[PDB]
Every structure is written in structure tokens, then in C-alpha cells.
């Protein structure tokens with residue numbers, strides 16, 4: 059019988075779909091429409107784990123809801139694939155958004171394809187071959203996007219983000235995130251925390267803010283008004299329907315947006 063593979067987040071649906079092709083079923087643990095930051099496990103979803111053979115986990119802080127779901131299920135001892143086993147993690151609390159990096163995605167894809175190959179040896183060769191072809195497309199995505207960068211960002215080019223999602227993404231450009239607006243992962247800032255953030259943006263002369271496309275924040279225009287910073291939006295790859303192509307479609311948009319913020323910070327003759 060065909061493997062039934064549980065996934066927790068949209069990038070993982072894309073990774074597994076691209077690895078298995080038509081040789082296994084990819085099943086989301088939470089229905090399309092839920093914000094995974096806000097999701098609380100339902101009996102309906104807990105029941106579905108009983109029909110699965112394995113669950114692929116981010117397991118580094120972005121799907122603790124999944125481990126609770128499995129604990130409360132008919133199958134508490136279900137095999138689990140820890141996708142981030144070989145991924146260098148930053149760092150205290152680990153930033154769990156490793157899926158928003160092309161290089162960490164490739165590492166994750168390879169770990170998953172290997173682990174799935176052991177559970178289903180009949181399709182192991184297909185899983186390994188598909189992982190290699192998906193990785194090749196991912197490297198090309200990054201290469202084409204980085205080639206459009208005329209210059210590296212200037213020394214004073216400082217970046218802020220609303221959600222703490224993009225440290226792994228910006229590392230691909232050799233950049234760091236100067237400040238994150240949300241005080242903690244998926245936590246909304248209070249008026250005093252937002253004032254503190256604005257003071258920091260001004261004091262450190264932060265040039266750009268990457269806001270959320272997926273579940274936008276209501277306070278973003280105040281930050282832009284009060285600090286004069288340029289606004290660009292990025293995708294956490296957490297909204298809408300699950301699809302095999304979702305990850306590369308949205309990562310291509312994310313890389314192009316980062317390139318555009320860097321080119322737009324570049325001055326000409328004056």
C-alpha cells in the first residue's frame with residue numbers, strides 16, 4: 059500500500075510532493091485556511107493521524123501543535139521525520155523558519171527523501187532521484203535571483219522584519235536582520251513594545267521593513283509613518299491551499315523582493 063505522509067506546514071507539503079511524485083499520498087495535519095501560528099488541535103484533525111504511516115516535522119519550534127496532536131491520537135508512537143536534523147540553527151530560542159532558506163530547504167529535502175526511502179524501499183531510488191531534481195531547481199531559483207544583484211547592500215543597509223521569519227533567507231545574501239517587530243514568535247506587540255521598536259529603527263537608521271503578505275499586521279503603517287522606513291512584503295509560505303509548486307513560486311517572489319529592496323537602496327549620480 060501507498061505511504062500516507064503527514065505534513066504540518068506548506069513548504070513541507072511542497073518538499074514531500076516533489077520527492078514522492080505520484081508514489082505516496084501527502085496529507086496536511088491541519089486544513090487549508092488555518093494560520094499555523096494560531097491553530098489549536100481539533101478532535102477532527104487528531105483522528106486523521108490514525109490513518110497515517112509517518113509525519114514529517116519541522117520539529118524546531120514551528121509545529122509544536124503537531125507533537126501535541128500525535129500525543130492525543132490513536133497512533134502516539136507514529137514514526138516521525140525530523141527534517142531539520144542536519145540544518146545549522148540560529149540562535150535563547152532557536153529561529154524555527156529554516157524552510158525560508160533555499161540552502162536549508164535542500165538539506166531538509168535530502169533528509170526527508172532519505173528517511174522516506176528507508177520506510178518505503180520500493181520507491182527509495184525514485185525518492186532520491188526526485189530530491190536531486192528538486193534541489194537542482196531550488197539552486198537555479200537562488201542563482202537567477204542573486205545574479206540580478208548589481209552590488210551587495212552598502213554597509214549602512216539595515217533591515218527590519220515584522221515576523222521573525224527571514225533570518226535564514228537574508229543569510230543567503232550574507233545579510234542579518236537588525237530588528238524584529240514581534241517581541242516573540244507570533245506574539246503581537248503592545249503599544250509600548252511598538253514605541254521601543256520605532257525608537258530602535260530611528261536610532262540605528264533602519265532603511266527597510268519586510269512586512270507579512272500572508273496574515274498582514276494592522277500596525278505596519280504606523281511603523282512606516284513614525285520611522286520613515288521603506289516597506290516591502292514577504293511570504294511566510296503559510297497561506298491558502300497546499301500545492302507542490304507553492305514553495306518555489308513563493309520563494310522566487312521572496313528572493314526577487316529582497317533583491318529589489320537592495321537595488322532600490324542603491325543611489326546614482328548626485
Ligand code: NI
Pocket residue numbers: 095120155221223243244294
Ligand atoms: Ni512563523
